[PDB]
Amino acid sequence: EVQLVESGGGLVQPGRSLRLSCAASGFTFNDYAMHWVRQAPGKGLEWVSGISWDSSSIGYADSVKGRFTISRDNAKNSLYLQMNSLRAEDMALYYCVKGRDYYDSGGYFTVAFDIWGQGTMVTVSSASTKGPSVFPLAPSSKSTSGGTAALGCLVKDYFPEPVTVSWNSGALTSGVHTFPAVLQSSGLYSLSSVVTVPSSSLGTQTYICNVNHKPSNTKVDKKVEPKSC
């Protein structure tokens, strides 16, 4: 095997600091330039930092000089990243990466990042953990509409992610679409899971949505039922 696993991630308020650990194994750590790439949720990859085999050249993503410090300790066989004055733009998944640095022409070159880590999430927010409010989006829109009747559940005002939603204690799976959570104007999150059921059948069946928000120990099952319109 040859593994890079990281630790240190978690929630943190803006302005404050985190130190991030990565511990590699299954290769001669000494020899490789190591680096950190982060990826913000729904955005792409952004290279944060990197350091030579013996720490003699070090670099930082231009948006991070003065706040992040990279440092290596070869005896322990770990990379670390000390993060400071953390703003909201540093909220992301951080990856530990290993340079296939072995190259040399004029210079000795890190040509590729080949082994990557899995990530630690760093969530900078000032919100407190809050469980959702679950509201029905009640089936109809005509009573029916455009056929197969949409119906669903708004899972509102919680922190942090994630929250799980299933319909009908796990057995209703088709037509179910659960949208990506959205983070609101100031704070918490909002998400909907919705279903189209054959209009026909509405009045016979029960539709229950199971939302479990584990960071707050919240399990709500809200039976959706139509209003009349």
Partner: protein, 212 residues
């Protein structure tokens, strides 16, 4: 410092086609460009480096060529497992290019709009969310506008999009409008107006306060 960009931003293709993705880097980068495949919820996977050299185990159908300021990645046969985002990174200064998401081409399907009032349960809490659902469509570009009364065109919404569905390969979308309870009951028609190229006029779904 090197600015790297990609064309296309997005791509529809179907399994079999040779597609090509481009990576331009504002200062000579020579050979020092690489390429990654990423599917959402997975790690980046190095496909090419030193502009041409594939890693071990990448399938021979990917390739790369380029020379210093212009670099390209070709898949000869798309198989149903190369629909992902591809990024290029340069190695003088490690800035990655923006990405290129490839999706599965398919026939246009115009969405079915469904609209949902505030529940009176939510309204006790003193706020109101009006949800409009555009359900099942292709292509991904389809816009939503909100009107509350006559036409007060509203600017304060959040849309969210599901991934391309694995069986039919459509997308669905939500747009929540949020008003406090006070401006909500200070208005009457609420409309969700959908535009999508597979519709020849825009659909408006609407509803009136109280009398639902």
């Amino acid at each position: 410092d090197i600015q790297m960009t990609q064309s296309p931003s997005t791509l529809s293709a179907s399994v079999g086609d040779r597609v090509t993705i481009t990576c331009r880097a504002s200062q000579s980068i020579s050979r020092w460009l690489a390429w990654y495949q990423q599917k959402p919820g997975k790690v980046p996977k190095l496909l090419i480096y030193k502009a041409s050299s594939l890693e071990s185990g990448v399938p021979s159908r990917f390739s790369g060529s380029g020379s210093g300021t212009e670099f390209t990645l070709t898949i000869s046969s798309l198989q149903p497992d190369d629909f992902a985002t591809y990024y290029c990174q340069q190695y003088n200064s490690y800035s990655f290019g923006p990405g290129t998401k490839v999706d599965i081409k398919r026939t246009v399907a115009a969405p079915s709009v469904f609209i949902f009032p505030p529940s009176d349960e939510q309204l006790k809490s003193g706020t109101a969310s009006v949800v409009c659902l555009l359900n099942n469509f292709y292509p991904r570009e389809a816009k939503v506008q909100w009107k509350v009364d006559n036409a007060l065109q509203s600017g304060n919404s959040q849309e969210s999009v599901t991934e391309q569905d694995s069986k039919d390969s459509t997308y669905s979308l939500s747009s929540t409008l949020t008003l406090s309870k006070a401006d909500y009951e200070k208005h009457k028609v609420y409309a969700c107006e959908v535009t999508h190229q597979g519709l020849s006029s825009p659909v408006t779904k609407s509803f009136n306060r109280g009398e639902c």
